[PDB]
């Protein structure tokens with residue numbers, strides 16, 4: 001039975017490996033989702049910023065027009 | 068007494084999680100700065116409007 005215990009060790013190792021893969025794929029999935037959300041947010045913010053710049057440009061223009 | 072399994076686990080194929088985590092960092096910072104400049108642009112907008120009605 002000196003060998004069966006090594007087969008047990010083998011099985012434990014294959015389990016550990018499997019669990020590792022599952023945790024890694026879950027982390028990669030969360031991160032991908034994160035990067036997606038952040039990209040959407042940064043696109044909306046970038047839009048807001050652009051619009052605000054346009055507005056400020058017009059206000060400044062008018063202000064100068066009344067000098 | 069199996070922490071070694073976890074360590075070598077988080078050492079295998081690090082390129083993916085590394086790239087996704089770095090991109091996550093760059094996007095978090097890009098976001099923060101965008102929010103800041105939105106705040107500043109809004110302040111400037113308010114300032115210009117006040118100046119535009121007070122003279």
Ligand code: NA
Pocket residue numbers: 110111114
């Ligand atoms: Na201001």
